[PDB]
Amino acid sequence: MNIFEMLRIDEGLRLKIYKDTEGYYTIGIGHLLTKSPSLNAAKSELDKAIGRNCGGVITKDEAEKLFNQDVDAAVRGILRNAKLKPVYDSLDAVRRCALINMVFQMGETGVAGFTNSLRMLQQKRWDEAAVNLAKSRWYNQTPNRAKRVITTFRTGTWDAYKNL
Numbered sequence: 001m002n003i004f005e006m007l008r009i010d011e012g013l014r015l016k017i018y019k020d021t022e023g024y025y026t027i028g029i030g031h032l033l034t035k036s037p038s039l040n041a042a043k044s045e046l047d048k049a050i051g052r053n054c055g056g057v058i059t060k061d062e063a064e065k066l067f068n069q070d071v072d073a074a075v076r077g078i079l080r081n082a083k084l085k086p087v088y089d090s091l092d093a094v095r096r097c098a099l100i101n102m103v104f105q106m107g108e109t110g111v112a113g114f115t116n117s118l119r120m121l122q123q124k125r126w127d128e129a130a131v132n133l134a135k136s137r138w139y140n141q142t143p144n145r146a147k148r149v150i151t152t153f154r155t156g157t158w159d160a161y162k163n164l
Contacts, residue, residue, distance in 0.1 A: 001158045003071060003097050007104060009164050010145050013063060017042055017056045021142055028063030030104065031070060074100055077108045084112060087122050095121070098152040105145075106138065121153065130154040 011030030017039070020026045025033045025042035033045040039056075046054050050062050078084045078099065088099060099121075102111045112118075114136070120129035130150050133139065139146040151160040 001161060003100050004067070006097055006101060006158075006161060007067075007071070009161055010101065010105075010148070013060075015058055015060070015063065017046065027058060027066075029067040029070075031063075031066045070104065071100070074104045078103055081108050081112060083118065084108065087118050090122050090124075092156055094156050094158065095153055098149050101149050101152075126154050126156075 008029060013029055014027065017025055017027050017033070020030070020032070024035050025039065025045075027033060027046060031049075033042045033049070036042070043054070043056055046056065046058075049066065050058060078088050084099070084103070088096060091099065099111070114133070117129050117132045120132060130153060133150050133153070134146070136146075139150075148160040152158070
C-alpha cells in the first residue's frame with residue numbers, strides 16, 4: 001500500500017462536481033474547488049484547473065492529474081513548514097503516510113494547529129498521541145476516516161486499510 005492508494009480509499013473518486021462532507025464544491029479524488037456557495041464559482045474554478053470547459057464534468061485522467069498535483073503539493077507543504085518538517089523527518093515510512101493524509105484533508109495550517117499531538121508523535125508516544133488526536137472537531141466530524149489515520153499512527157502498519 002502507498003499514499004496514493006490510501007488516499008484513494010479515504011476520498012473516493014467522482015467525475016461530476018459534488019459537495020464534500022463540509023458542503024463544499026469538490027471533484028475527483030477530494031480536490032476542493034471553492035468554499036463558495038456558488039455552483040457557478042465552482043464551475044469557473046474547475047475550468048481554470050483543467051484548462052478546458054468542463055461543464056462540471058471531467059475524465060478519469062484529469063482526476064488523476066489533479067490527484068498527483070495535490071499529493072505533491074501536500075508533501076512540499078510539509079517540508080516547508082517549520083512545524084511540520086521536524087515531525088515528518090522523525091517518523092517511519094508508514095506514519096509519514098498518516099501525516100500526509102491529514103495535511104491533504106485539512107491543510108498545513110490546520111494540522112500545524114495540533115500542537116500537543118505533534119509533540120507526542122515526535123516523542124514517539126503512540127498511544128498517547130492517538131488519544132489526543134481523537135479530541136478534535138476532525139475526529140467528531142469524520143470519525144471513520146479519522147480512526148483509520150489514527151490507527152496508522154498508533155501502529156505503524158497498514159492494518160486499518162487492509163480491510164478496505
